[PDB]
Scaffold this motif. Structure first.
Motif, PDB file in Angstrom:
ATOM      1  N   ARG A 270       0.849  -1.179   0.000  1.00  0.00           N
ATOM      2  CA  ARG A 270       0.000   0.000   0.000  1.00  0.00           C
ATOM      3  C   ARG A 270       0.888   1.234   0.000  1.00  0.00           C
ATOM      4  NH1 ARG A 270      -4.766   3.189   2.885  1.00  0.00           N
ATOM      5  NH2 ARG A 270      -4.834   1.805   4.683  1.00  0.00           N
ATOM      6  N   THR A 271       0.977   1.925  -1.120  1.00  0.00           N
ATOM      7  CA  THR A 271       1.921   3.026  -1.219  1.00  0.00           C
ATOM      8  C   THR A 271       1.269   4.400  -1.260  1.00  0.00           C
ATOM      9  OG1 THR A 271       2.068   2.519  -3.601  1.00  0.00           O
ATOM     10  CG2 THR A 271       3.780   1.699  -2.177  1.00  0.00           C
ATOM     11  N   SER A 272      -0.044   4.482  -1.321  1.00  0.00           N
ATOM     12  CA  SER A 272      -0.731   5.752  -1.290  1.00  0.00           C
ATOM     13  C   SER A 272      -1.420   5.912   0.058  1.00  0.00           C
ATOM     14  CB  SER A 272      -1.725   5.847  -2.438  1.00  0.00           C
ATOM     15  OG  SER A 272      -2.467   7.048  -2.372  1.00  0.00           O
ATOM     16  N   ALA A 273      -1.455   7.138   0.570  1.00  0.00           N
ATOM     17  CA  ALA A 273      -1.987   7.379   1.896  1.00  0.00           C
ATOM     18  C   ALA A 273      -3.489   7.389   1.939  1.00  0.00           C
ATOM     19  CB  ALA A 273      -1.497   8.703   2.429  1.00  0.00           C
ATOM     20  N   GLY A 274      -4.138   7.457   0.817  1.00  0.00           N
ATOM     21  CA  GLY A 274      -5.567   7.299   0.823  1.00  0.00           C
ATOM     22  C   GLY A 274      -6.321   8.514   1.331  1.00  0.00           C
ATOM     23  N   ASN A 275      -7.525   8.241   1.830  1.00  0.00           N
ATOM     24  CA  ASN A 275      -8.328   9.245   2.510  1.00  0.00           C
ATOM     25  C   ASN A 275      -7.981   9.196   3.989  1.00  0.00           C
ATOM     26  OD1 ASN A 275     -10.614  10.637   3.839  1.00  0.00           O
ATOM     27  ND2 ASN A 275     -11.330  10.825   1.730  1.00  0.00           N
ATOM     28  N   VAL A 276      -7.399  10.281   4.478  1.00  0.00           N
ATOM     29  CA  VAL A 276      -6.895  10.344   5.837  1.00  0.00           C
ATOM     30  C   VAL A 276      -7.376  11.631   6.465  1.00  0.00           C
ATOM     31  CG1 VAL A 276      -4.938   8.898   5.307  1.00  0.00           C
ATOM     32  CG2 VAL A 276      -4.758  11.319   5.052  1.00  0.00           C
ATOM     33  N   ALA A 277      -8.677  11.912   6.317  1.00  0.00           N
ATOM     34  CA  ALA A 277      -9.288  13.142   6.822  1.00  0.00           C
ATOM     35  C   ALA A 277      -9.342  13.183   8.342  1.00  0.00           C
ATOM     36  CB  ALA A 277     -10.691  13.280   6.257  1.00  0.00           C
ATOM     37  N   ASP A 278      -9.551  12.044   8.981  1.00  0.00           N
ATOM     38  CA  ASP A 278      -9.647  12.017  10.424  1.00  0.00           C
ATOM     39  C   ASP A 278      -8.295  11.969  11.098  1.00  0.00           C
ATOM     40  OD1 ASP A 278     -12.308  12.186  10.295  1.00  0.00           O
ATOM     41  OD2 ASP A 278     -12.689  10.024  10.374  1.00  0.00           O
ATOM     42  N   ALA A 279      -7.227  12.029  10.326  1.00  0.00           N
ATOM     43  CA  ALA A 279      -5.862  11.851  10.776  1.00  0.00           C
ATOM     44  C   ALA A 279      -5.184  13.142  11.224  1.00  0.00           C
ATOM     45  CB  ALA A 279      -5.054  11.234   9.651  1.00  0.00           C
ATOM     46  N   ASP A 280      -4.173  12.964  12.048  1.00  0.00           N
ATOM     47  CA  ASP A 280      -3.173  13.963  12.394  1.00  0.00           C
ATOM     48  C   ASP A 280      -1.904  13.572  11.634  1.00  0.00           C
ATOM     49  OD1 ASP A 280      -1.419  15.836  13.749  1.00  0.00           O
ATOM     50  OD2 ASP A 280      -2.699  15.726  15.498  1.00  0.00           O
TER      51      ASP A 280
ATOM     52  N   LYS B  99       4.667  10.409   5.303  1.00  0.00           N
ATOM     53  CA  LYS B  99       5.441  11.610   5.105  1.00  0.00           C
ATOM     54  C   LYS B  99       5.415  12.049   3.670  1.00  0.00           C
ATOM     55  CE  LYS B  99       8.877  12.200   8.635  1.00  0.00           C
ATOM     56  NZ  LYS B  99      10.010  11.715   9.386  1.00  0.00           N
ATOM     57  N   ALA B 100       4.998  11.186   2.782  1.00  0.00           N
ATOM     58  CA  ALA B 100       4.927  11.550   1.388  1.00  0.00           C
ATOM     59  C   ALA B 100       3.574  12.087   1.006  1.00  0.00           C
ATOM     60  CB  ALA B 100       5.274  10.352   0.524  1.00  0.00           C
ATOM     61  N   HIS B 101       2.546  11.757   1.760  1.00  0.00           N
ATOM     62  CA  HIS B 101       1.291  12.466   1.636  1.00  0.00           C
ATOM     63  C   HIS B 101       1.440  13.894   2.139  1.00  0.00           C
ATOM     64  CE1 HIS B 101      -3.039  12.511   1.072  1.00  0.00           C
ATOM     65  NE2 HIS B 101      -3.110  13.226   2.177  1.00  0.00           N
ATOM     66  N   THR B 102       2.013  14.027   3.329  1.00  0.00           N
ATOM     67  CA  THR B 102       2.274  15.280   4.019  1.00  0.00           C
ATOM     68  C   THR B 102       2.838  16.317   3.060  1.00  0.00           C
ATOM     69  OG1 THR B 102       2.606  14.049   6.069  1.00  0.00           O
ATOM     70  CG2 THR B 102       3.605  16.167   5.949  1.00  0.00           C
ATOM     71  N   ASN B 103       3.701  15.862   2.153  1.00  0.00           N
ATOM     72  CA  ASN B 103       4.456  16.705   1.241  1.00  0.00           C
ATOM     73  C   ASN B 103       3.828  16.850  -0.134  1.00  0.00           C
ATOM     74  OD1 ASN B 103       6.482  17.254   3.017  1.00  0.00           O
ATOM     75  ND2 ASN B 103       7.860  15.709   2.212  1.00  0.00           N
ATOM     76  N   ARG B 104       2.619  16.362  -0.348  1.00  0.00           N
ATOM     77  CA  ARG B 104       1.948  16.553  -1.630  1.00  0.00           C
ATOM     78  C   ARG B 104       1.851  18.032  -1.937  1.00  0.00           C
TER      79      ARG B 104
END
Ligand SMILES: Cc1cnc(C(=O)O)n1Cc1ccccc1
Ligand SMILES: [Zn+2]
Ligand SMILES: [Zn+2]
Length: 231
Positions: A174-184, A226-231
């Motif tokens: 799983r290499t994509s962070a997906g839907n992470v709306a409820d996330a910190d 950390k790679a979602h973070t940096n989109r």
């Protein structure tokens, strides 16, 4: 070999023995036109069973109990939900009817009533602060901080060196962070650090969804995150 999503019809459940007295339960659900797999955990507690997370929906949790009966024929008496999402509380009503005592942290309980999800009955006390750990029969419960959700819990089984990390932990494939709306996103990696430092002795790491690996799943999830973070 592990059950993959391409091997489980939506409505069936599989059990996978990981050690003596430690299974995982695998199931499937459709959501936004795609199908995903979901995990949870079963730990033997003498003559009772401890269930970690539901099987993502009423129907699947009914099958999850029926497959427990067919294959272990021991009773599930306590259930912990590891965050407020449907893949973790979908089916708390089916468990409670079956006479299972369902538990979650108060943060999980609050967020579930707010989102309109099913609410574990009992409130797990003593986990509100990052790093907090409590015992619970044959497992340890750990709040690593906010991550996939602010309320997400990881479970370690010491007898078997098993770490159930839940949706806070991704499978390798799983290499994509997906839907992470409820996330910190900002704390998620610090939160994984805490997991590493509290259970370095983990040999068997289980994610919320997909294949189990080892602690390397934590570097992996740090990375995808950390790679979602940096989109
Ligand atoms: C639909 C669902 C439920 N839980 C999650 C998650 O990321 O934990 N997701 C998103 C997901 C799950 C598995 C694979 C990819 C995306
Ligand atoms: Zn979730
Ligand atoms: Zn999930």
């Amino acid at each position: 070999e592990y059950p993959t999503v391409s091997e489980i019809p939506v409505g069936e459940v599989r059990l996978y023995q990981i050690a003596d007295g430690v299974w995982s339960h695998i199931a499937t659900q459709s959501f936004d036109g795609a199908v995903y797999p979901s995990n949870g955990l079963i730990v033997r507690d003498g003559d009772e069973l401890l269930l970690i997370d539901t099987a993502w929906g009423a129907k699947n949790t009914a099958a999850l109990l029926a497959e427990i009966e067919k294959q272990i024929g021991l009773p599930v008496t306590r259930a912990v939900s590891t965050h407020f999402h449907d893949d973790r509380v979908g089916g708390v009503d089916v468990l409670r009817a079956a006479g299972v005592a369902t538990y979650a942290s108060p943060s999980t309980r609050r967020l579930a009533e707010v989102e309109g999800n099913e609410i574990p009955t009992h409130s797990l006390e003593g986990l509100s602060s990052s790093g907090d750990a409590v015992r619970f029969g044959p497992v340890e419960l750990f709040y690593p901080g906010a991550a996939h959700s602010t309320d997400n819990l990881v479970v370690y089984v010491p007898s078997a060196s098993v770490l159930y990390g839940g949706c806070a932990i991704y499978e390798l494939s799983r290499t994509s962070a997906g839907n992470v709306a409820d996330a910190d996103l900002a704390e998620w990696p610090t939160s994984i650090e805490r997991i590493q430092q509290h259970y370095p002795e983990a040999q068997f790491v289980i994610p919320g969804h997909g294949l189990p690996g080892g602690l390397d799943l934590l570097k992996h999830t740090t990375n995808v995150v950390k790679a979602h973070t940096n989109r």
